[model samples]
Target: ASLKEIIDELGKQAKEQNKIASRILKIKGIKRIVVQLNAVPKIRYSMTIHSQNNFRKQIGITPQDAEDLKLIAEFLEKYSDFLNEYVKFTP
Candidate 1:
């Protein structure tokens, strides 16, 4: 894609893709969570976040970040319902 194409495509992506980080945290129970990707998904609903917070005590995230995840989860939970009831989750 050329610069013009990329620029033209900007704001063309679904909001879901941009909010993926937040969505991943929300769907799972974690914060400051980094989902390692052996493979990435093209759809907003396809991405999966690494569930393990701390494997080696230093490899995981802190408790503070968990709060962020919690918030996102709560929002997504509500958003899910809203999307279904109000917009069919298709738009």
Candidate 2:
């Protein structure tokens, strides 16, 4: 697929995950927050300092962070499939 197609697909996935993340936060007693794909890079950075298994463990975030992470993880999981496929055609 072209890079634009991959990006568009990821954008679609992120929009879908936003709803899923919102529902999760409600069930977990955490208020819903905007799940921006732009924040995914920061989220992954924070995860390096904290464990993905440990939600909000000494991190500078609220329960909403947990929800954001869940959304990013799912979005990235689907994204990786496209990325892996695309890279095979490159050097």
Candidate 3:
């Protein structure tokens, strides 16, 4: 695939993952969740979800949350690696 095609597909995958993560968080009554993926050479992506209720204000990271975050992190890593390999910076 061309560069554009690859990047587009990566974005599509990211969006789908975001939706899945949000759904999981909603089902678990998570008020807020933040995921940050940072890489060298200015590759960065962040996902955040804020649900309606704040009943579980003091709750920490649950197993479900951790698993979702792990998947996201893995995807982000792959995305960043692809960019680093296939994308070139020019002045």
User: How do all models score by TM-score?
Assistant: 0.30, 0.31, 0.29
Task: Work out how many backbone clashes candidate 1 has.
Answer: 4
lDDT of the candidates, in the order given: 0.39, 0.39, 0.41
- For each candidate, C-alpha RMSD in Å? 10.2, 11.8, 10.3
Model 1 agreement with the true structure over 1-91: per-residue lDDT tens digits? 4322322233234342553222222234444554321111232222234445453254444566768567556755765654344322111
Error of 3 at 33 (Å): 6.0
TM-score of 2: 0.31
Query: Any residue pairs clashing in model 3, and if so which?
Result: none
Error of 3 at 11 (Å): 12
> Model 3: per-residue lDDT, tens digit, 35-83?
3221112323333433224433543555657655665556557567776
Between the candidate structures 1 and 3, which one is better when assessed by lDDT? 3
What's the C-alpha lDDT at position 23 in model 3? 17
Per-residue error (Å), model 1, residue 34 = 9.6
TM-score of 3: 0.29
Report clashes for each candidate as comma-separated counts.
Answer: 4, 0, 0
- By TM-score, the better pick of 1 and 2 is 2
lDDT of 2 by residue, 45-75 (tens): 1112233345446445666577656765665
